[PDB]
Symmetry: C5
Subunit: 52 residues, 5 copies
């Protein structure tokens, strides 16, 4: 291999400045964006309910 | 195979905390986003019609 | 290839509840989204011109 | 080839109704969207500065 | 190789009109968009707090 031990070692070396179970990093970026769309929606609705 | 029975079994094992015909999960994330764009549009128009 | 006649027949069977030249279905989803971005833009500008 | 002369000829045939150096078509769709996000941002800020 | 020296040389040739450590270019486009979603959110909230 040498090619993998080099790539995996390159990450653990540049990722020693983070603290997440990985899975949360990926799930959060995607789940977040979709969560944002729904958040901005319920938001605009609030503002409207106030103008009534 | 062993490689598939391992991947399919890994999902049914981590997906036992869900209840959807799969198809709705995929169709909803994509159909939803597009639905959001149209929803936010008809929304801004409403607010405008009120400022007139 | 029995494999194609099975896939093409599966669509014409589940698509008998639609009426579009196909091409409009694909062109509309993509052209629409891009059209939405430009629509929401000219929109925000309108609202602003009104607050002036 | 015959496969390429057929695909390239199919485009120049259906693209004879356009006038762009190609590069602008691709760069514009992507650069535009990103430009839109920044445009909508500076926009909301304007409206706010007016409500103050 | 001749194929790589040709692609890498084609970039450094068309990128001599930029000044960024590369990494910031990629990290900024993605980090920016996500930053925008959060920015627009805290924004709508501000406006609301003002209508109260």
């Amino acid at each position: 291999m040498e090619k993998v031990q080099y790539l995996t070692r390159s990450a653990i070396r540049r990722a020693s400045t983070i603290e997440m179970p990985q899975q949360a990093r990926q799930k959060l970026q995607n789940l977040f964006i979709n969560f944002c769309l729904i958040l901005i929606c319920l938001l605009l609705i609030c503002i409207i309910v106030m103008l009534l």
